[PDB]
Design goal:
Shape of chain B: flat
Number of domains of chain A: 2
Order of helices and strands of chain B: EEEE
Largest interface: A-B, 68 and 33 residues
Membrane topology (chain A): Peripheral membrane protein
Protein name (chain A): Serine protease NS3
Bound molecules: ligand A1B82
CATH architecture of the largest domain in chain A: Beta Barrel
Strand content of chain B: over 45%
Subcellular location (chain A): Host cytoplasm; Host endoplasmic reticulum membrane
Structural class of chain B: mainly beta
Distance between the termini of chain A: 22 Å
Radius of gyration of chain A: 15 Å
Order of helices and strands of chain A: EEEHEEEEEEEEEEEE
Organism (chain A): Zika virus
Number of strands of chain B: 4
Distance between the termini of chain B: 41 Å
Shape of chain A: globular
CATH superfamily of the largest domain in chain A: Trypsin-like serine proteases
Largest sheet of chain B: 2 strands, antiparallel
Helix content of chain A: under 10%
Helix content of chain B: under 10%
PDB class: viral protein
Oligomer: heterodimer
Radius of gyration of chain B: 17 Å
Number of helices of chain A: 1
Strand order of the largest sheet of chain A: 1-2-3-7-6
CATH topology of the largest domain in chain A: Thrombin, subunit H
Strand order of the largest sheet of chain B: 3-4
């Protein structure tokens, strides 16, 4: 339960397949809903049970409520701490674009990584998590542009 | 049964590989949390 970024793995398929990524912060595990699909997780001898989740926001928290509250300022560059399947965690600095929707504008990272990278945190200059990578759109050139998905803190 | 293994710390790293463009896309989000390009 130490704070940090974690791989989300499964043994249901061939070998150990990485289905996604998530953030442990303040005893709560945060990830994209499509990674676990709300299922319980294992952390050595311990077990993480879901606490909050939403399919539209595509988010889910384990052990407690969503703790991440920081946001992109619309101006500065961010870093995607990408954790790719079978590959070492690595920070990729980019300047986000905009997903323009009827309910508002959202930041967007135009980096392409395998779908098992879903749940990797997007960071600001203070190392604060401003969102999760993994939910976006496929553009004209086949590549992926993911939204900067952040939940609510109560 | 899904499981988790630590992959690293969450810190900002100066002198990182800077790449990627900043596109402005008109999108729509359905009840299933799936984005789609509006053109
Ligand atoms: O499929 C992806 N993401 C996803 C999947 C299922 C659902 C949602 C998002 C939200 N509603 C359920 C994905 C993620 C990433 Cl990082 N690269 C990719 N390239 C192609 C696809 C894709």
């Amino acid at each position: 339960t130490t704070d940090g970024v974690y791989r989300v793995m499964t043994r249901r398929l061939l070998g150990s397949t990485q289905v996604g990524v998530g953030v442990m912060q303040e005893g709560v595990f945060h990830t994209m809903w499509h990674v676990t699909k709300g299922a319980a997780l294992r952390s050595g001898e311990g077990r993480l049970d879901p606490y909050w989740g939403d399919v539209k926001q595509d988010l889910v928290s384990y052990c407690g409520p969503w703790k991440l509250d920081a946001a992109w300022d619309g101006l500065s560059e961010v870093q995607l701490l990408a954790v790719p399947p079978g590959e070492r965690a690595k920070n990729i600095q980019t300047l986000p674009g905009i997903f323009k929707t009827k309910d508002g504008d959202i930041g967007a990272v135009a980096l392409d990584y395998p779908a098992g990278t879903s749940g990797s945190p997007i960071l600001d200059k203070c190392g604060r998590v401003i969102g999760l990578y993994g939910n976006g759109v496929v553009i004209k050139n086949g590549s992926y542009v993911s939204a900067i998905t952040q939940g609510k803190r109560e | 049964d899904m499981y988790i293994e630590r992959a690293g710390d969450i810190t900002w790293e100066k002198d990182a590989e800077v790449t990627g463009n900043s596109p402005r896309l008109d999108v729509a989000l359905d009840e299933s949390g799936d984005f789609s390009l509006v053109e």
